[PDB]
Design a protein around this nucleic acid. Sequence first.
RNA 1: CCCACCCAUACCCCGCCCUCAGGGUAGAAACGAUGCCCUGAGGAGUAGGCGGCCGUGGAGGUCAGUGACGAAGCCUAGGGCG
RNA 2: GGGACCGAGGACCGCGCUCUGCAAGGAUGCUGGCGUAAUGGUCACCAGCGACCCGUCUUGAAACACGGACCAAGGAGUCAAGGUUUUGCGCGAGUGUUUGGGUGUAAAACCCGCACGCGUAAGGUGAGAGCUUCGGCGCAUCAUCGACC
RNA 3: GAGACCGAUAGCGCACAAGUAGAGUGAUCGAAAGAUGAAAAGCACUUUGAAAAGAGGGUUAAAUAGCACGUGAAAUUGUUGAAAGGGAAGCGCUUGUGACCAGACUUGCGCCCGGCGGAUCAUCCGGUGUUCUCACCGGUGCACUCCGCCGGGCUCAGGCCAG
Lengths: 129, 52, 127, 149, 139, 169
Amino acid sequence: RKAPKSDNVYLKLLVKLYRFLARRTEAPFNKVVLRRLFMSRINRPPVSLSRIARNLKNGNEKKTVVVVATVTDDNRLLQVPKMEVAALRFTAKARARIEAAGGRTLTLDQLALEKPTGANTLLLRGPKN
Amino acid sequence: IWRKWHVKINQGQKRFATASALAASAVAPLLMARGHQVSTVPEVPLVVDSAA
Amino acid sequence: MVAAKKHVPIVKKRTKRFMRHQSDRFKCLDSAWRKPKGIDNRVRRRFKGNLAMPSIGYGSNKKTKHMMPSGHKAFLVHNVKDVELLLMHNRTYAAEIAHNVSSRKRIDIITRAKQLGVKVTNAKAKV
Amino acid sequence: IPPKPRKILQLLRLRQINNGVFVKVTKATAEMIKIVEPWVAYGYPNLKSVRELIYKRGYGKVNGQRIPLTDNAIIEENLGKYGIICIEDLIHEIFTVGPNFKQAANFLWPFKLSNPNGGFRPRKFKHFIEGGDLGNREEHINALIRAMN
Amino acid sequence: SNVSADLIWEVSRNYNSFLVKQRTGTFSRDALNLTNQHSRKHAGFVNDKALGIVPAEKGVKVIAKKVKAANKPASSLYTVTYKSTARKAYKAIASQAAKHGYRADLRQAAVARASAILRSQRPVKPEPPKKLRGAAARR
Amino acid sequence: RYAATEIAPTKSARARGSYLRVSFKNTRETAQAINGWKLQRALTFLQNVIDKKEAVPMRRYAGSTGRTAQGKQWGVSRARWPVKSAQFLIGLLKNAEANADAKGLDTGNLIIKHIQVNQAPKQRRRTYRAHGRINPYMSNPCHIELILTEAESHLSSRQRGVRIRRALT
RNA sequence: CCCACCCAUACCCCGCCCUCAGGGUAGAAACGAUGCCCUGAGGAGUAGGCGGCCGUGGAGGUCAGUGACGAAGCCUAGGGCG
RNA sequence: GGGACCGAGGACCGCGCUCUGCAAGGAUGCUGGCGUAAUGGUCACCAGCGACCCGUCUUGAAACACGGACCAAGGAGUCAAGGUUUUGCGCGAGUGUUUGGGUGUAAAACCCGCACGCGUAAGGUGAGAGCUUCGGCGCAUCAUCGACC
RNA sequence: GAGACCGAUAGCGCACAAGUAGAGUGAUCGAAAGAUGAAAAGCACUUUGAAAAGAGGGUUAAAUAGCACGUGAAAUUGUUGAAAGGGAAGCGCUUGUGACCAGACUUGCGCCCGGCGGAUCAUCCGGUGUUCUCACCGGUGCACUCCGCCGGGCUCAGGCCAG
């Protein structure tokens, strides 16, 4: 794909930023993020707070969590650990619960500033099935 | 006469659009791009005293 | 000024039009091109000695497209404000006053265009 | 054309008419050509034929593109890992069939030759030994190459 | 923030009140547009730093944007009228466009616009009489 | 309005008739017979047609038309005597002659410069036919107009050099 | 049996059009980036599928748009663009 | 040595050579006539070569058959309900104001109290995108052994 | 009271003396058909004609608006102008003839002299505005500096077809 199917102006800016990064860097992280900005919404399933909490259980703490999707809230999780999450969108409850725990929420353009090469990052995807 | 003349729009999207319209009204370049003669007025979000 | 920018020679691959099939025979059929949809018509099958079919092969050079023989590109103009839009394009564009512009407004457009050095395609209509 | 000769011509990169390729003689390759005899004329080229084919009609397959061989840097960038760094190394590889003939020949885009100057023969679709143009001419392919170049 | 030159271009690239569209090209009526062409380089109202030249009674009137007054239109344009020699006008305009990092890409375009206005202010030569040919000449 | 608009009305005399109940085809042929003639010659000819002394040639509308020796003057065999058409043409020629007298022209020098016959809106009359059909008998009227008028170098250097030498010698 | 010659849209070289594919383009002297530049290949086409563009009636905003010094419409062995 | 067709690009950069330079990543130099219907273009006609009348239907295909005197205007996959797939948008374990009520510059726009429709109330091993402090960590998904109801 | 409706083959069959004219024994069936001009100012008068009308003359901004009335396409027809035509015409490629035409060009740029006509010449000082180092106003700068014109010389670039 060359042009995203979305009509969002800010999504076009994100694509333009990461198209520049993918061309001028050798990081496969930037190519994955760029290609995920192009795909459809059904191809970008939501990632819940429970799923991200599972994936940093072992040793992936103090890392940057990056999903090119919307981050949702889960009522099954009673305690939310401190984490660094960057995503396309956050729900009102998921953003509040992350900030209440003590973590920080980022956008994809802030991620480019902080981690232009995807260093120390945990990249996840939602359940396709 | 049964032709679905009216359109159902989510109240969330209606309020999103109004917020975007208000924000664009504070942007000086967009005022000129829409045909408004904004050259002799200061403070594009022009606030006049309620006493006047 | 009157002289246009230096350009490659203007070539036209085909000069005559693409007449519609059997439009020479019927008055109801206009000469405007229509693609024949029949399965046995010899125009569609490209038999020799028949009318040609328009195609992208006849496409004119990109560097010479939309240029009149003088080497300018026509820009339709309705008032004096339109010719000042051409101030930066003396050598690349020419002014074409619209068919509904009055006689007195035409004099103003031509007077301004001469000041700007912009060529007018129809400067002698109502003179 | 029957399906069997069609596949061989695709495998020999003989897609259009007057396309020429270099093949090293081998029982694996000899039998392939013997099946496409009613469509090909082949023989043994000399040094002049190899030299003028590469110099005048030599194009390389660089990243899937047909790039003319106008400089030694083109050959070295694509065939320098085998020891071929110039135009004469490429000719030497093809003429004196060396260890890297497969890489040198496949690098060479199939040659696009003109129709012969002087014609083929009164009847060109008979075997060469019957007065035609098809089959093995052996050292007579050089005279044909001069006409098509 | 949410508003930038990149956003205003995205909002206003396809349609504007300044846009003129025909078959032979797209023009712009923006007063801060040096070449009157629709492009991000030349869209004055989009850009934070931009230039524009308009004729005066004698000379040129150059307007530049003030970055610290983007929300005050009445005090957002730095206006200089050049009524001296043509060469002095070109020197100031080019220095205005390049000596401090204020749209050095528009240096050549700005000087050309000043030249065209000064040339257009010159007296006009009378056109030669029209010559008839062939059938028209014989009638 | 008139069709021949290149004639100044001050130097000419004109006459006109509209919705005239005569055969269009017959009137067209007899108008063509007197085209370009003198006024007095046409008047004598049109009278002779009524008395069957001269015949009007049928050029275009002559399908299955008889032959006479009076057509030999025109070079055709098919000629006829449109009496009704001649009478209408006589009246218009007399009227145009009267208009010429009022203006002051010379009637002995007038020629028929322009004569035209056009078609009028058709009239209708239904006749009775067998097998359940009613046949129409549409008439064919015509318009007539006529006007009377008085009878009355960029040579090359080689080309220039050659011409100078030839002029000297 | 031998020599030369004739010509297909077929083969070779060059120009132009379009499509596809592969590359470049920001401490921006910077861009209809939906753009521009470089290289290579390809071009019949019914049913069918996808994309762009043209035209008509009406609506919103916009061109401080055109017009009795003449809108629209109609005629044109008068031109320009595609 | 004698002809023919062509001159694409537009500051420099490269490979090079016979180096005060050059035929080396694409034409320059000198000269003449004319500067107007002269080149060029549109029509009509003559001339040389070329060229079946369209559509429908049937059939492997033709042929037959059917419709066609001419022109202008009109003229045929639309609307509604219910399913369903894909794209964009909002919110997201929730979502849906517009039956209704309350304002209004009054069929617009703005707001929402109670129900209601649809949905919801944690392992081992091998691959595997992507990170890496080079030791390893491992999304989604698949294969296998699981665990629970 | 309104319309993102239709605009005289549309919209109700009916924008008009329309459920009328007309058809059928009857029940019933059922059309076509709007527009001169701001104002009739709807052509006095003269002449030819039996008349219908025609021609002058006149009203009018217009009769190229005369109640066969806004604008007035095509099929079809007349006249005039041009051309072609030994059992079809029409169509494609390429010249030629004849008629008819759109462009292009008319000079610009820059140097060297001479005659001028005028102080927005460089610098410095004050004020102001800005992109904070760049400008603009006022003064100084009253002439080998600067700006426009005119008269010469020269360079370069300029249209078409060619060698």
